[PDB]
Amino acid sequence: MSELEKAMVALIDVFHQYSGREGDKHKLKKSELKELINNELSHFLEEIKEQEVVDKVMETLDNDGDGECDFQEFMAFVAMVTTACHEFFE
């Protein structure tokens, strides 16, 4: 696979690794999303150690209002983080 193709498979992989832990296997619940950020975005995002922060991140991400982050929402999250990095480091 190319570098881009690899990167895409890696986004699918990490989503599944966290979404399948509990409840809906295809959605991130707040605790799944917290572990994903803390473990996998430890350099791009401040560690989450407060319920209020987990809450705010889900509120921000959850466009369909079911209190979970689905794959489309996770893509949007990936784009906002990646964009932030893009901008920040130039």
| DSSP sequence for 30-90 | HHHHHHHHHHH-TTTSPPP--HHHHHHHHHHH-TTSSSSB-HHHHHHHHHHHHHHHHHHT-
Q: Which is nearer to a copy of itself, 8 or 24 (CB)?
A: 8
Choose, by CB under 5 A, the member of 7, 9, 24, 47 that binds Ca ion: 24
Residues that bind a copy of itself (CB under 8 A): 1-14, 36, 39-44, 71-72, 75-76, 78-79, 81-83, 85-86, 89
Q: Which does 14 bind (CB under 5 to 8 A by kind): a copy of itself, Ca ion, none?
A: a copy of itself
